[PDB]
Amino acid sequence: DIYGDEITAVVSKIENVKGISQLKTRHIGQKIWAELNILVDPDSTIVQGETIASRVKKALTEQIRDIERVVVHFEPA
Amino acid sequence: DIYGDEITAVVSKIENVKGISQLKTRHIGQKIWAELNILVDPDSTIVQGETIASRVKKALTEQIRDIERVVVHFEPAR
């Protein structure tokens, strides 16, 4: 959904992501350290999941300002 | 994320919390303001959810005295 936090907004537009099971953010003033767990099709390969995780990472780091750190883990839908 | 883990660790042991959907910590000096959305049984009532969420807010304020301020929201799991 695009009406929640900025990260979830970025991720709602990535077709192959079906959900975020867990979003953890740390804030020291404007600076953001993030850790996410996305849900992808459970019959995806592990390399397919990685690819999507990299896609999400890339999207987040260019679309969102003051990202110090972002890790994306993937998990079955 | 030191408090991240510490928070997750405490909530992990609270009966009827099925998961953490969202954790936000903000550093204000050397104290912490935290905001969590916890996962509870979808078939419980709202007042049972608020009961669980208050148990979490207390466990966290007590066990991590670095945390000045904590808000807990809840929402349904699967």
Domain ranges of chain A: 1-77
CB A24 within 8 A of CB B1: yes
Method: X-ray
Laid out side by side, the sheet with B67-76 consists of A67-76, A31-40, A19-28, B19-28, B31-40, B67-76
Element (H, E) at B49: helix B46-63
**Tokens in use for B21?**
């959907």
Residues A25, B24: C-beta atoms closer than 8 Å: yes
Smallest CA–CA distance from B36 into chain A, residue: A24
If contacts are CB pairs under 8 Å, which of residues 31-50 in chain A contact chain B?
33, 35
**Measured between CA atoms, how close is A47 to chain B, in angstroms?**
25
Beta strands in B1-78 (DSSP E): 19-28, 31-40, 67-76
Q: How many other C-beta atoms can be found within 10 angstroms of the C-beta atom of residue A9?
A: 14
List residues bridging with B77 in a β-sheet. Answer: none
List residues bridging with A26 in a β-sheet. Answer: A33, B25
**Measured between CA atoms, how close is A45 to chain B, in angstroms?**
24
Resolution stated for this PDB structure, in Å: 2.0
Angle, CA of A21, B9 and B36, to the nearest 5°: 50
Provide the 8-state DSSP code for B15: T
Altogether, the residues listed in chain B come to a count of 78
